[PDB]
Design a binder for this molecule. Structure first.
Ligand SMILES: [Mg+2]
Ligand SMILES: [Zn+2]
Lengths: 556, 1341, 51
DNA sequence: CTCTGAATCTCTTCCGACGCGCCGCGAAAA
RNA sequence: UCCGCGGCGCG
């Protein structure tokens, strides 16, 4: 039905009416015993009409309506992505669902997710009704709907009651791997955005760029048990593609850990011997000794015996006070030697994997949560930030570029003299430019990586530099060597879309100003990469669908 | 010097390169095209007159009647754009066409006319272009994106060897006509040449050659080269050209004139060729073996019996030579072929084609292009000739002819629009050359082979189609009807042309909705250039080759603006300086260079011309007269980068801003960030939302002024003067004494759009920005629009931003925001939605809106008025009623017992149901306007009379001010005339206006002027009277509503939106972000001066994104506000004007050899005071895109403001209080708010409506539908196991009605047990398959 | 219509447990084909079943 | 010199992620 | 009001 008593016609009806018209006309035509030409033409018209009714469009031009649209047949309703099978039978739309944008929840634990209050109310309304009937406050479901709409203060308390242990499945579209759906035990937050634990953001492949995700709630006791047992984020911490752990600290937490464990040769309070990590905490929180001070502290470590008993040992050893602070949160079974290093993402991954392989799941979960908290805290206290002065430009760059300019100039003259061919000259120009790039990159890394420092005796010493970008890239927290190379040194010798190197180097760095022709050359690779990345998803999804549908039968 | 408005707030520049060409009007690409489409033109190369000349005259095929066209006229539109949009109709103009019908006498000549009839026929409607470059088609605002289609012409392209094995390349030649069928020539791996039409089945090529009057032999003479043989005394001789032996091995001796010399077994070296040349060898004698295996060139016939022997193309042999010798042909003609050059390909084609004459080829082509029908001489001939060699079905447009002549290196630049046989032969020749290797393919995506087709051309083509439709209509009319009892308006029919135009402008893929978020969106949408649409290409098949940036795109298409996603590369943008050629190719400006010196003359070059020259770019440095500084200058020769001497350059790049479009040019410090994030930032600027208040960007690029000016968002005074009246709604300007038209009122009025719904449901408002008695120059901005400040574009706000990982709240691009900005409302926005209710003639009475409504509480009714419409200014929540409408139920008969029971229960058993309109779920706000419309003849309620009454008083006061102005002017003229003679000025001023008019000046010429002025008063009186009464008619008249609708009502609901956690928040340079925490003001970090930081960005984004622009901007912003504070403090200190003039003068003078060179000594003290007032907290900075502020100048600016030079300052933690160990970057950043409001996307369904077809829940928030649990999630559950959860999902929460009902009862009861059941969707499938004529059933039932 | 693609005689009632001509309107009439009009009185669900 | 089988060519068919959001608009049928 | 088709963006 439509407005004003009008109607919209389902496509099947038009085809059926056409077939009825033709059939009745043929019946009345045969009744009158007309010559064979008329009946044969009419019956072939009926044949084509029923052909369209069944599988419109398979043979010849499909019959079309006033909207010049190719009309849907019975066959067309089954075949295709829009057909009954793919659209309806699999992927039925479900009740008790919501969707919202995500927000980092730092204060959360590993397994509890923040949920907007309004969404919780709507999703659990059946349970609110049930408990309200249980407490007798609402005599009828009408009353329950009233008070739940009237948001009486008791309703919120009931809502806290019902969600006390009821997990929710949480999905981010599109699911790419079985880690794409996880169950959390919710907590209530104000606002209209789902708070997520930072760690699992890697597993969900989320990036908090205004990306949306959805929530469903199981209903049966059975489904709740599957959620708590199977889908709980505390379990399944190891990816099924490969045994490597999926919950890996990255970005800010890695930065905080690396800044915390790093040493500086001269710092406030260095040299003093301290009884234990407790007093190390006292010293630093009193601001009496900097985080990077190298001191001697007493520590204790434990190890499983042949029977698994944690035999203890203790001694005095050199330690940065920050690493001493770290030793608090370590579980009781870890050996100390692992922490004794400049922690990076690879090291931290090895660390968490270590405590998983040695101690139980609960120690690893607790350890991950505590390392999360501490990493964020001391990264905050770090104040590590990037300034315009950080991308220091090596003075050798002007010299190296000068040398390369001469080398290319003389080579070009040699080509103009007829001594070398165009292709040969092209190749050797590429070679000399590559050599220049290597030289300048090496020089820039050498300048950046080390800083001049003063010792206790005032003598010149050298240490790993504390330049912000260097520590950001070295720690592995959202960076690598290529980007820092492009930041201040040569950008390189990338190619045209055909793959040919343009033979004219991208000279300046991003701190310097890329010239118009330079930048416009630089954009070709960017456009090609963006287009390829955008277009790959279709084929990747298709390949996945085929593979899944081939392998769906097997079961141990 | 500077204008008054620019004097208000002068934006300091840093550009070093001097500017030459001012930025052209941004909207040209639309306006110029429609001008070419709509204005009169006698020559009429392109336009409506061109269409009329291309269709009319139309003559009866064998009669004595003719219909000829004279002229076209466009009538004035019924409504203006404002009236049109408020009414909600098409802003159209009528096409009036002068038409003549002529009838001849029967006697020859045909020109012996005997009767004519002439009149102006109405010819439908055309949507007219608005001054801001948009269409108003259905009350809505719509725009056309121009299409970058493949240019008509001829293209030679290879498959690069993918299709065939061994990488063997197969070449193709393709002809693209502007309208009609295509034509392709292709090479098969067997090196045979084939032709095809409209991608039908392949054919041998020469048949088309045979299709024309071209027998085999003559075709051979055209295509190949000849060789002559003679047989004398059983000795074979042939003529020689030395170049022929290039590439041949000397297997046999070479002898001539008694001289034998050849390197037997070796190649014929060039030395041998030169020796033959110097010997001048004309003929040589060859053995029988050489002529064996050769192919004859022509047929040979013997007269001994009258028989034909060894027809052409037949390969010679001993028997053939004996036969020809004995028969008597002493002269033999063959063709010459080499494997390296002059391939035998045509010979093989002639050996393979089954056809033997013109008829057989025509039969073949008929059999090919139309299967399933019998061949026939006349029909085949007719369809062939009309398909290819007639303007009826085929026309290579003028641009096509130009491209064609250029491709085949002809001399003529113009020619026929229809193909010719010699052209086909030339195409064959060129293709054979390409396959031989003496030619080159052409890049398909080279921008010289793409053409920008604008609005006018598309509308012209559609109108031409409609015209041919009406042409057949009138043809059959004239053919059938009598000749002297009719008149052209009878013959014509407007419906087809009008339908075609309307369908093109409404439903075509290239007529999408015109988005109106911010003026930048306006400009970038109107300047967008797309490759989609008709005749273009589809999204799902565009390969990477089309999408990549070709080197010819320089200065013509910006690499940056192009959208991300599946549309990447296919939707380009037009650069700032580029413009469209006459043929439709892309032009760019350049500066001519001479004697190593560039000069100010400007050339416009197309792509192909640019290919020839060698041009250097703006990074090159110039001095004095513009002489090149560096000896070796980098250029762009022939599409590749290199360096040359000063003497070798041809043209120089017009300006540093050449390569970038508007959207990306608005980004500061573009040359410091990676192209990926720059592209994303330029794209994402377009989604900014106008805030309640606007603030200028501290760091700008200088384009904001131009972008705002050209964009139609702002009101621009058409004539300069001094402002007479200022009000929030209207502005009144008084023009200058030298500006008035002779005999004019001299006063202008503008009405400001106050609060109306945008196209994207945002808010459009305008603010007066001038003071009383303010002088105004022409082109000055008179009313700031949304996202605009004093004529400067202002998308977002300036915020104090510090980079530090302050807590977990910045984990991935997550922005943590101070409550201080929420309290100041810096980011609040306003949204306006609309709701509609429609009245239609239901059975047993139409739907009626009324105050009374059953089953509704009293308070809800009280919100409505007596008419049933909410009062303006009443807040509404979700689900409240706005328009109280009821609808008759029909008969709804009940038995007397049931009716009595209903009466006992109450007022039930009524045949009227509720149909009132309610607020959509979750929506809330306040009502700002109610619009009502009603079919003519239907009564208008008191409310509608009320709105119409306010309308009429507004119109009446407008015209009353108009008449008072005109009375003032006319009586000023009266007083001036009286002063000029018979002066009674004191009495005139004392006496009322009637005495001014009545005075008779003793019948002088001054008295004649007084009488003329009285007549002027009279005529203006009647003019205003008739215009006002016409306005009353149009307001009072009914409405052309949809059929079946008696009356409609529309209500506008306005709501105010604030920053909310989870909302998205933009920063240009691609710094995306979600707001993740609102902190109380006392927790954020602060500086030693106690000022807290508003936004804490995650530093981790910068190193991996290489958005090093943003940090730079931050530092620059830090300097800007610094200066402002001092200026601010220096205003608070209330010190001398002169010393602050000194300070600001130093601030502007700080630039190292910048171009601006402002001199404050020329400013009056009021100007300096006003400037300082604007300069408080400001000091805007303009940095051109690639001629921007070097870091050194930013350091100098920082040191001027006493800020630390490093740009990193110490901070204190709000909650802890000790210093952060390392200094933290603190600065000022321009942050935007994006349309992705978190409170709009958040949604929760639980239980609700179900789709009728499959009982599944609906989809979409607007209909309160649930989410979709797609197949991906099915596999996700499948992997984990959790089979029970999946079953619960599928059976209860989605499909099984019985199961979900039982489950609902269980949950209400507290029992949580599953009740499985057969999904109804599967039953649906079972029935559907059962409809196919297939038995499907369950087993073991 | 009397014999159309939505015929009540063929595909069932237009409303749950209500005859086409309204002769019977009580649940006790379950499974009764109206003599006056000939339409079986049952649930509207059969409009999904009967082909 | 002719007939049959084998192999290629020519035509036809199928199909290229997915989740939303937004926007607009149906009729020679009544 | 719940129907269908086309275009646009987000992730
Ligand atoms: Mg993403
Ligand atoms: Zn009945």
């Amino acid at each position: 039905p439509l407005d004003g008593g009008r109607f919209a016609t389902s496509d099947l009806n038009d085809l059926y009416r056409r077939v009825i018209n033709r059939n009745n006309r043929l019946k009345r035509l045969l009744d009158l015993a007309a010559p064979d030409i008329i009946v044969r033409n009419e019956k072939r018209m009926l044949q084509e009409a029923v052909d369209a009714l069944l599988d419109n469009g398979r043979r010849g031009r499909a019959i079309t309506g006033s909207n010049k649209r190719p009309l849907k047949s019975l066959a067309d309703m089954i075949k295709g992505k829009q057909g009954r099978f793919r659209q309806n039978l699999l992927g039925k739309r479900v009740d008790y669902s919501g969707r919202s944008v995500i927000t980092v929840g730092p204060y959360l634990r590993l397994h509890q997710c923040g949920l907007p209050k309004k969404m919780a109310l709507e999703l659990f309304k059946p349970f609110i009704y049930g408990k309200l009937e249980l407490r007798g406050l609402a005599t009828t479901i009408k009353a329950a709907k009233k008070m739940v709409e009237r948001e009486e203060a008791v309703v919120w308390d009931i809502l806290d009651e019902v969600i006390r242990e009821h997990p929710v499945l949480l999905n981010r579209a599109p699911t790419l791997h079985r880690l794409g759906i996880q169950a959390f035990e919710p907590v209530l937050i104000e606002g209209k955005a789902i708070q997520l634990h930072p760690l699992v953001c890697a597993a969900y492949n989320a990036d908090f760029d205004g990306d949306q995700m959805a929530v469903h709630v199981p209903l049966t006791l059975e489904a709740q048990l599957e959620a708590r047992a199977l889908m709980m984020s505390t379990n399944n911490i190891l990816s099924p593609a490969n045994g490597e752990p999926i919950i890996v600290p990255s970005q800010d937490v890695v930065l905080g850990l690396y800044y915390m464990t790093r040493d500086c040769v001269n710092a406030k309070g260095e040299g003093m011997v301290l009884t234990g990590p407790k007093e190390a905490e006292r010293l630093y929180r009193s601001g009496l000794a900097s985080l990077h001070a190298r001191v001697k502290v007493r520590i204790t470590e434990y190890e499983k015996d042949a029977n698994g008993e944690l035999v203890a040992k203790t001694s005095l050893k050199d330690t940065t006070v920050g690493r001493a602070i770290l030793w608090m949160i370590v579980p009781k079974g870890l050996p100390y030697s692992i922490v004794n290093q400049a922690l990076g993402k690879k090291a931290i991954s090895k660390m968490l994997n270590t405590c998983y392989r040695i101690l139980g799941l609960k120690p690893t979960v607790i350890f991950a949560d505590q390392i999360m908290y501490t990493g964020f805290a001391y990264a905050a206290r770090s104040g590590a930030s990037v300034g315009i002065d950080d991308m220091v430009i090596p003075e050798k760059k002007h010299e190296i570029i000068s040398e390369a300019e001469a080398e290319v100039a003389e080579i070009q003259e040699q080509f103009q003299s007829g001594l070398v061919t165009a292709g040969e000259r092209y190749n050797k120009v590429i070679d000399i430019w590559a050599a220049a790039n290597d030289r300048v990159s090496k020089a820039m890394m050498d300048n950046l990586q080390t800083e001049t420092v003063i010792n206790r005796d005032g003598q010149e010493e050298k240490q790993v530099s504390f330049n912000s970008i260097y520590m950001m890239a070295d720690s592995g927290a959202r960076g690598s060597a290529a980007q820092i190379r492009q930041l201040a040194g040569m950008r390189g010798l990338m190619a045209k879309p055909d793959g040919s190197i343009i033979e004219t180097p991208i000279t300046a760095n991003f701190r310097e100003g890329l010239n118009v022709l330079q930048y416009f050359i630089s954009t070709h690779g960017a456009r090609k990469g963006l287009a390829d990345t955008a277009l790959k998803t279709a084929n990747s999804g298709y390949l996945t669908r085929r593979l899944v549908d081939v392998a769906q039968d097997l079961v141990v | 010097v500077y204008s008054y408005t620019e004097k208000k707030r002068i934006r300091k520049d840093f550009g070093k390169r001097p500017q030459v060409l001012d930025v052209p009007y941004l909207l040209s690409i639309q306006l110029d095209s429609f001008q070419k489409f709509i204005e009169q033109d006698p020559e009429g190369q392109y336009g409506l007159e061109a269409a009329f000349r291309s269709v009319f005259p139309i003559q009866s095929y064998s009669g004595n009647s003719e219909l000829q066209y004279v002229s076209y006229r466009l009538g004035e539109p019924v409504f203006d754009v404002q009236e049109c949009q408020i009414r909600g109709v098409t802003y159209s103009a009528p096409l009036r066409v002068k038409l003549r019908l002529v009838i001849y006498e029967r006697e020859a000549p045909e020109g012996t006319v005997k009767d004519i009839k002439e009149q102006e026929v109405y010819m439908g409607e055309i949507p007219l272009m608005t001054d801001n470059g948009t269409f108003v088609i259905n009350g809505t605002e719509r725009v056309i994106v121009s299409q970058l289609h493949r240019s008509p012409g001829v293209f030679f392209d290879s498959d690069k060897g993918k299709t065939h094995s061994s990488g063997k390349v197969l070449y193709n030649a393709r002809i693209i006509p502007y309208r009609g069928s295509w034509l392709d020539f292709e090479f098969d791996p067997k090196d045979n040449l084939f032709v095809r039409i409209d991608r039908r089945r392949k054919l041998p090529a020469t048949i088309i050659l045979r299709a024309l009057n071209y027998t085999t032999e003559q075709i051979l003479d055209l295509f190949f080269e000849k060789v002559i043989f003679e047989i004398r005394d059983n000795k074979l001789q042939m003529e020689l050209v030395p170049e022929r032996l290039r590439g041949e091995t000397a297997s046999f001796d070479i002898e001539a004139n008694g001289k034998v010399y050849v390197e037997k077994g070796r190649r014929i070296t060039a030395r041998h060729i030169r020796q033959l040349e110097k010997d001048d060898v004309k003929l040589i004698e060859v053995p029988v073996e050489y002529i064996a295996g050769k192919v004859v060139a022509k047929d040979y016939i013997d007269e001994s019996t009258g028989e034909l022997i060894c027809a052409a193309n037949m390969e010679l042999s001993l028997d053939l030579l004996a036969k020809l010798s004995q028969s008597g042909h002493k002269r033999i003609e063959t063709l010459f072929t080499n494997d390296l050059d002059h391939g035998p390909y045509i010979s093989e084609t002639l050996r393979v084609d089954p056809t033997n004459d013109r008829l057989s080829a025509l039969v073949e082509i008929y059999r090919m292009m139309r299967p399933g029908e019998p061949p026939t001489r006349e029909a085949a001939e007719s369809l062939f000739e009309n398909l290819f060699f007639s303007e009826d079905r085929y026309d290579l447009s003028a641009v096509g002819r130009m491209k064609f002549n250029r491709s085949l290196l002809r001399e003529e630049i113009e020619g026929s629009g229809i193909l010719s046989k010699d052209d086909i032969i030339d195409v064959m020749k060129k293709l054979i050359d390409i396959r031989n290797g003496k030619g080159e393919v052409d890049d398909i995506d080279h921008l010289g082979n793409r053409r920008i087709r604008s609005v006018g051309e598309m509308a012209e083509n559609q109108f031409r189609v409609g015209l041919v439709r009406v042409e057949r209509a009138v043809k059959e009319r004239l053919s059938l009807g009598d000749l002297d009892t009719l008149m052209p308006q009878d013959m014509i029919n407007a419906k087809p042309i009008s339908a075609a135009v309307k369908e093109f402008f409404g439903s075509s893929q290239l007529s999408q909705f015109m988005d109106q978020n911010n003026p930048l969106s306006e400009i970038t949408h109107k300047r967008r250039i797309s490759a989609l649409g008709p005749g273009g290409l589809t999204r799902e098949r565009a390969g990477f080759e089309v999408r990549d940036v070709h080197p010819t795109h320089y200065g013509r298409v910006c690499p940056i603006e192009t959208p991300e996603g599946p549309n990447i590369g296919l939707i380009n943008s037009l650069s700032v300086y580029a413009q469209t050629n006459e043929y439709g190719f892309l032009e760019t400006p350049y500066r001519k260079v001479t004697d190593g010196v560039v000069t100010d003359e400007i050339h416009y070059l197309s792509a192909i011309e640019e290919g020839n020259y060698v041009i250097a770019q703006a990074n090159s440095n110039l001095d004095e007269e513009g002489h090149f500084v560096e000896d070796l200058v980098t250029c762009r020769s022939k599409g590749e980068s290199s360096l040359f001497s000063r003497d070798q350059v041809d043209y120089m790049d017009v300006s540093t801003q050449q390569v970038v479009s508007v959207g990306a040019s608005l980004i500061p410090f573009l040359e410091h960030d990676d192209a990926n994030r720059a592209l994303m930032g330029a794209n994402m600027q377009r989604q900014a939302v106008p805030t309640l208040r606007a603030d200028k960007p501290l760091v700008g690029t200088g384009m904001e002024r131009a972008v705002a000016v050209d964009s139609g968002v702002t009101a621009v005074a058409k004539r300069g003067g001094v402002v007479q009246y200022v009000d929030a709604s209207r502005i009144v300007i008084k023009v200058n004494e030298d500006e008035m038209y002779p005999g004019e009122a001299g006063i202008d009025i503008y009405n400001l759009t106050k609060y109306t719904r945008s196209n994207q449901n945002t808010c459009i408002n305008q603010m007066p920005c001038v003071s009383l008695g303010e002088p105004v120059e022409r082109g000055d901005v008179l009313a700031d629009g949304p996202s605009t400040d004093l004529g400067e574009l202002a998308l977002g706000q300036n915020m104090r931003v510090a980079f530090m990982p302050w807590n977990g709240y910045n984990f991935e691009d997550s922005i943590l925001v101070s409550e201080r900005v929420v309290q100041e409302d810096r980011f609040t926005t306003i949204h306006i939605q609309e709701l509609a209710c429609v009245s239609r003639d239901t059975k047993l009475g139409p739907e009626e809106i009324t105050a009374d409504i059953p089953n509704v509480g009293e308070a809800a009714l009280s919100k409505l008025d007596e008419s049933g419409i909410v009062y303006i200014g009443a807040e509404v929540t979700g689900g409240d009623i706005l328009v109280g409408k009821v609808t008759p139920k029909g008969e709804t008969q009940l038995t007397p017992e049931e009716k009595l029971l209903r009466a006992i229960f109450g007022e039930k058993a009524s045949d009227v149901k509720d149909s009132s309109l309610r607020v959509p779920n979750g929506v809330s706000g306040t009502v700002i306007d109610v619009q009502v419309f009603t079919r003519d003849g239907v009564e208008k309620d008191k409310r509608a009379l009320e709105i119409e009454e306010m309308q009429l008083k507004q119109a009446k006061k407008d015209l009353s001010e108009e008449l008072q102005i005109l009375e003032a002017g006319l009586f000023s003229r009266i007083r001036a005339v009286l002063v000029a003679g018979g002066v009674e000025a004191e009495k005139l001023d004392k006496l009322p206006r009637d005495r001014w008019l009545e005075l008779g000046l003793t019948d002088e010429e001054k008295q004649n002027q007084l009488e003329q002025l009285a007549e002027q008063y009279d005529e203006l009186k009647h003019e205003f009277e008739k215009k006002l009464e016409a306005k009353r008619r149009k307001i009072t008249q009914g409405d052309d509503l949809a059929p079946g609708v008696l009356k409609i009502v529309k209500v506008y609901l306005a709501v105010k939106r604030r920053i909310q956690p989870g909302d998205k928040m933009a920063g240009r340079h691609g710094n995306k972000g979600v707001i993740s925490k609102i902190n109380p003001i006392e927790d954020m970090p602060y500086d030693e001066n106690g000022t807290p930081v508003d936004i804490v960005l995650n530093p981790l984004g910068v190193p991996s994104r290489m958005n090093i622009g943003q940090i730079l901007e931050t530092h620059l912003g830090m300097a800007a506000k610094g200066i402002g504070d001092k200026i601010n403090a220096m205003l608070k200190q209330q010190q001398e004007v002169a010393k602050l003039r000194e300070f600001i003068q130093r601030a502007y003078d700080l630039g190292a050899d910048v171009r601006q060179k402002v001199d404050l000594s020329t400013f009056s003290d009021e100007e300096v005071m006003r400037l300082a007032e604007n300069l408080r907290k400001g000091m805007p900075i303009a940095t051109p895109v690639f001629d921007g502020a070097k870091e050194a100048e930013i350091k100098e600016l920082l040191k001027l403001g006493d800020l630390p030079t490093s740009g990193q300052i110490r901070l204190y933690d709000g909650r802890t209080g000790e210093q952060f160990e390392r200094p933290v970057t603190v600065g000022y950043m321009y942050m935007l708010k994006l349309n992705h409001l978190v409170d709009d996307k958040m949604h929760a369904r639980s239980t609700g409506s179900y789709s009728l077809v499959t009982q599944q829940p609906l989809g979409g928030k607007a209909q309160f539908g649930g989410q979709r649990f797609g197949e991906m999630e099915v596999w996700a559950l499948e992997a984990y196991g959790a089979a029970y959860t999946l079953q619960e999902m599928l059976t209860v929460k989605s499909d099984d009605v019985n199961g979900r009902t039982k489950m609902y009862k269980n949950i209400v009861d507290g029992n949580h047990q599953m009740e499985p059941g057969m999904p109804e969707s599967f039953n649906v499938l079972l029935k559907e398959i059962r409809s196919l004529g297939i038995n499907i059933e369950l087993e073991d039932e | 219509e009397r014999d159309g693609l939505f015929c009540a005689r063929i595909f069932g009632p237009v409303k749950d447990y209500e005859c086409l001509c309204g002769k019977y309107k009580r649940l006790k009439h379950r499974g009764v084909i109206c003599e006056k009009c000939g339409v079986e009185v049952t649930q509207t669900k059969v409009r999904r079943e009967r082909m």
